[PDB]
Amino acid sequence: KEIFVSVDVETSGPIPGKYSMLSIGACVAFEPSKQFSCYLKPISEDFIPAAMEVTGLSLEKLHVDGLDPVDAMVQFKEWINSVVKEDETVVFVGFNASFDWSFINYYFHVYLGDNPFGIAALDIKSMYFGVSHASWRLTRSSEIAKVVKPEDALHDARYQAELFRLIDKLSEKKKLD
Amino acid sequence: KEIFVSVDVETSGPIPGKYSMLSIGACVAFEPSKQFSCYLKPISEDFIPAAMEVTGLSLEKLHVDGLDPVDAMVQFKEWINSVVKEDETVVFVGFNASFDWSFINYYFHVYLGDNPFGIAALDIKSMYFGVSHASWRLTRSSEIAKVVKPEDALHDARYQAELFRLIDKLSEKKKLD
């Protein structure tokens, strides 16, 4: 009875504390119509320029427009509990999950003292590495999209959820055929 | 041309910065005789008692006996470069990889400004989730060990490397049969 949740974050740099989680996007992997997204105020002035070029965001604007980090993580928790029943379990799902998890875990423990996702994350590249036993270099998103033919942090969350479903079907078929 | 590296860390709590990475163990997944291990001085006074009960370590002793964190990450880097050729690529491998990666990434960027593993980690639970398409709850180490029948941060690194090899063989066989 598991509810898989596709999560993606935008950040101003490679690690939390020194750098900031700037936005969260999340959808229910198998019910992507159920969606969560918000922007955060930075917790640091430091940033990597290449990282800010990727996001397109402004730290100065987010200091005015973003949510206080505690409010963001409270709302994320509320959402998670809204899509997961007491008799159900949540599973964090990400693409290069360890990056996004490092920020989600840091912020949950800093601001709320607990991470409702628990302690483990499901990583789609790692899943595909096992389904297809291709090289690690060939788990890049573009190389996956050639094999599985799929059709902003929320946009990334929805796209990654679709990869998850297709790799899921590929492993189910491989297992049951 | 990829060199997989099984890594495990011991920590005083759930997230870096607020809590400390206390020890590193690492072996070459497919050449486990090549091994790296060290203890670190804490970077924080905070700790979760349950976490310290698991490790058996003493923060007060590690402040005297451990390596300065910069020296630990320099030595880890040297080791990584010692087992990986210029024409080769390293792949971080962990069990619940996102936990260990969050500490390894934090410390590499804090102390050295770069992570030689890159930006992604291979997670064994996620790999097995795809090879076997079992439930996530059934990716726990004990449940994996029932199916694949395998035979301290270094001890964990070597054990997890053996799970990796067996799941690897299971996906190769599943793919080629």
Question: Quick one: CA torsion of B48, B54, B56, B60, rounded to 10 degrees?
Answer: -20
H or E element that contains B37: strand B31-39
Could you tell me the CA-to-CA distances from A33 to A94, A154, A155, A157, B110 in Å, in that order?
17, 11, 12, 12, 39
H or E element that contains A37: strand A31-39
Chain gaps in chain B, named by the residue before each (C–N > 2.5 Å): 151
Please tell me the experimental approach by which this structure was elucidated. X-ray
Got the DSSP string for B92-114?
A: EEETTHHHHHHHHHHHHHHHTSS
Is A50 at the interface with chain B, CB within 8 A?
Answer: no
- Resolution of this structure in Å: 1.8
- Nearest CB partner across the interface for A120, out of B96, B127, B130: B96
- Nearest CB partner across the interface for B102, out of A102, A110, A136: A102
Is B172 at the interface with chain A, CB within 8 A?
Answer: yes
Q: Which residues pair with A6 in a beta bridge?
A: A27, A93
Distance, CA of B77 to chain centre: 14
Indicate the burial class of A134 (C-beta count within 10 angstroms; 0-12, 13-18, 19 or more). middle
Using CA atoms, how far apart are residues A115 and A118, in angstroms rounded to an integer? 5
Taking a C-beta distance cutoff of 8 angstroms, is the pair B146, B155 a contact?
no
Right CATH number for A2-176 from 1.20.1630.10, 3.50.50.60, 3.30.420.10, 3.40.50.620? 3.30.420.10
Q: Which residues contact B56 (CB under 8 A, 6 or more apart)?
A: none
Using CA atoms, how far apart are residues A164 and A148, in angstroms rounded to an integer? 10
Chain B residues whose beta carbon lies within 8 Å of the beta carbon of residue A101: 98, 102
Backbone φ and ψ for A8, nearest 5 degrees, come out as -140, 140
